[PDB]
Amino acid sequence: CSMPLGMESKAISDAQITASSYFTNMFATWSPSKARLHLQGRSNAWRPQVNNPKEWLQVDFQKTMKVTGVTTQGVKSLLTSMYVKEFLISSSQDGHQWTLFFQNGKVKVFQGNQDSFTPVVNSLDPPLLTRYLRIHPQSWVHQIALRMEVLGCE
Amino acid sequence: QIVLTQSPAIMSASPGEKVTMTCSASSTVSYMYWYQQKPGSSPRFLISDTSNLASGVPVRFSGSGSGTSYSLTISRIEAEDAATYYCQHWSSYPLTFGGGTKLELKRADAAPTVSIFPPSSEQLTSGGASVVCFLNNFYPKDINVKWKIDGSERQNGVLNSWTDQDSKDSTYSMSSTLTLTKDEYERHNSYTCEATHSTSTSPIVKSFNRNEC
Amino acid sequence: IQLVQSGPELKKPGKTVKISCKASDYTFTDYSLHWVKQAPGKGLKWMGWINTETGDPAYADDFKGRFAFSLETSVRTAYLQINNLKNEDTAIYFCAREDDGLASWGQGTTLTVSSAKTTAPSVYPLAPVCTTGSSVTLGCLVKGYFPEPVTLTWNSGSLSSGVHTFPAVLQSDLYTLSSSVTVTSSTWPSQSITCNVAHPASSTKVDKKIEPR
Ligand SMILES: [Mg+2]
């Protein structure tokens, strides 16, 4: 039950992907919908307006889905590699009240990326069942940048 | 999955005029892209990200909209803007084009210039005989040709081809070709091409005799 | 930015064709590539895309089955294979480099699926009868070839103004095409006017001097 729910394919449409903020100006736009695994082009990743631990990227499956894992990836920009090392996951079913993802009682800190091109998979165990997924970067190298895929099924 | 619907399908405008054409999504998209295609050519990138002119594109072009409604505008249309215009989105699977808005240029009505040509000798030496008649630089596009041989009309053996709107002078042309056998052709002396066009109640006709000329 | 697709293809129903798409620069694994299909009277249909950094292809619903996208990164080329060809595969295939839109397009590749034979054209001069006034219209008829394309030029290309070339019309498995040219009577027949026709598929390369009757 570990299928790509449509970040890369865009079965998860642009408007289902949002965030607390994103980095943009005259030359570049690193919007939430850029957070699609293996995306190419310029500005091929989500980037928050600013770098801190209170930021998040949100996916709205619009349906209830069984999420079994997430895959994350960094990006290289102007010869510099940016990526998220550690992140938290929260979830909701109304998009206002958010449930942290715990494991062994404690709040789960996932180990994400160590470079900018290699994708890294993280299981959700136990399988999370939700409409709204959130990912919260907590540490990172140089800057917060994210391309991702949600793995699951109906 | 989002569908794109463009209106109008065909539209018409005089040089200098403004045209707006619309593109409605079935659901919100992030940006809308636009393309121009002239017949026989590749499509060409006009507008990136809903309202930015792609590289090399003249400034009489502009796009706008958001949500599910977008539009392209050409502020002061020129003759070379005759084309089909496509909108396109990539906000979800699958990538989709609209079905195209075809822009035709209105111009001064022009009657066809007609010319007729007898079978060539080389063709005759082979048992075929083609009579060709050119109907050039007329407007509007709707035209009718009929062939007649020594007074009496003739329907089949006839083959016709229309050009697309000229990107310079905005006219249309048509070639008509009536094919025969060398035997059949040599039975008759007068051949005639009849062009009926809305410029006149009376057709433009050309003729030849395989005698004399 | 340029993308250069390979040339026209005539294929037998049920066979396989592989169309290529070569890129000019090497910013190549930096942008995604798309395939778009255009059928004669239709607009544009997205076939799908391929990731140039990873090689991952993705197909549109209507193209899951007998289509394959692929690459050769060393030579900066994307490929499109079609298996078990049917009549409905007859069309133009474009490739496109995605860059905040489909920003560059290849010139297209016509595919014709048909069991019909390659047939060479005959080229006939069209001299006017007899000429009349200060300008005269000449012509050229290209008859009975298969498949498309032919190229036609006047005097190798030097005479291009005043020219009307007409799209090929198909009957029954044979194309016919024609071209007219208008010049000054002081120029013809004194000066020389030659019709230049090439049909690569049947390695045909003819020149017909238009000669007065
Ligand atoms: Mg912002």
Domain locations in chain A?
1-154
Which of B28, B90, B93 has its CB closest to that of A15? B28
Q: How many domains does chain C have?
A: 2
d(CA B61, CA B69): 18
Task: Specify whether C64 is located in the same domain as C148.
Answer: no
Please tell me the distance in Å from A38's CA to the nearest CA on chain C.
8
> Is-contact B60 B74, C-beta < 8 A?
yes
Task: Specify whether C139 is located in the same domain as C183.
Answer: yes
Structure tokens at C4: 């250069």
DSSP for chain A, please give it: --EE-STTTSSS-GGGEEES--EE-SS-EE-GGG-BTT--STT-SB--SS-STT--EEEEEEEEEEEEEEEEE-EEETTEEEEEEEEEEEEESSSSS-EE-EETTEEP-EE--SSSS--EEEEEEEEEEEEEEEEEEEEEESS--BEEEEEEE-
Task: Specify whether C181 is located in the same domain as C146.
Answer: yes
Which of A8, A9, A41 has its CB closest to that of C31? A41
Q: B108-210: which CATH architecture? A: Sandwich (2.60)
Nearest to C5 by CA among C32, C23, C25: C23
> Is-contact A58 A148, C-beta < 8 A?
no
CATH code of C89's domain:
2.60.40.10
Task: Specify whether C104 is located in the same domain as C156.
Answer: no
Rg from Cα positions in chain A: 14
Kindly list the partner chains of chain A, i.e. chains with 3 or more CB atom pairs below 8 Å.
B, C
DSSP 3-state of C87? helix
Q: A1-154: which CATH architecture? A: Sandwich (2.60)
3-state SS, C4-72, equals: EECCCEEECCCCCEEEEEEECCCCCCCCCEEEEEECCCCCEEEEEEECCCCCCEEECHHHCCCEEEEEE
Please tell me the distance in Å from A15's CA to the nearest CA on chain B.
7
Residues 6+ positions from C5 with CB-CB distance below 8 Å: C19, C20, C21, C22, C93, C94, C95, C106, C107, C108, C109
Nearest to A112 by CA among A88, A130, A134, A79: A88
All residues of chain C having their beta carbon less than 8 Å from the beta carbon of residue B97 are 43-46
Resolution in units of Å: 2.6
The per-residue b/e assignment along B95-121, b for 16 or more CB within 10 angstroms, e otherwise, is: bbbbbbbbbbbebeebbbbbbbbbbbe
Element (H, E) at B123: helix B121-124
> Is-contact A49 A102, C-beta < 8 A?
no
Of C66, C98, C116, the domain-final residue: C116
Please tell me the distance in Å from C23's CA to the nearest CA on chain B.
16
Nearest to B33 by CA among B77, B72, B61: B72
Q: Report CB contact under 8 Å: A15, B90.
A: no
Nearest to C8 by CA among C107, C102, C82, C95: C107
Q: Report CB contact under 8 Å: C124, B123.
A: yes
Task: Specify whether C125 is located in the same domain as C190.
Answer: yes
Determine the Cα angle at B102 with ends B100 and B108, to 5°.
Answer: 175
All residues of chain C having their beta carbon less than 8 Å from the beta carbon of residue A41 are 30-32, 98-100
Which structural technique was applied? X-ray
In this structure, which CATH number among 3.30.230.10, 2.60.40.10, 3.40.50.620, 3.30.930.10 belongs to the domain B1-107?
Answer: 2.60.40.10
Q: Which amino acid is at B133?
A: C
Task: Specify whether C66 is located in the same domain as C157.
Answer: no
Q: Report CB contact under 8 Å: B97, C46.
A: yes
Q: Give whole-number Cα distances, A72 to A36, A112, C18, C105, in Å.
A: 9, 6, 35, 32
> Is-contact A35 A44, C-beta < 8 A?
no
Whether B25 and chain A come into contact, CB under 8 Å, resolves to no
Q: How many residues does chain B have?
A: 213
Task: Specify whether C96 is located in the same domain as C125.
Answer: no
Element (H, E) at B172: strand B172-181
Structure tokens at B169: 């002078």
Of C116, C140, C171, the domain-final residue: C116
Q: Which amino acid is at C88?
A: E
Tell me which residue range forms the domain holding C143.
117-213
DSSP 3-state of B200? coil
Backbone conformation region of residue A27, classed left if phi is above 0, alpha if psi is from -120 to 50, else beta: alpha
Task: Specify whether C107 is located in the same domain as C141.
Answer: no
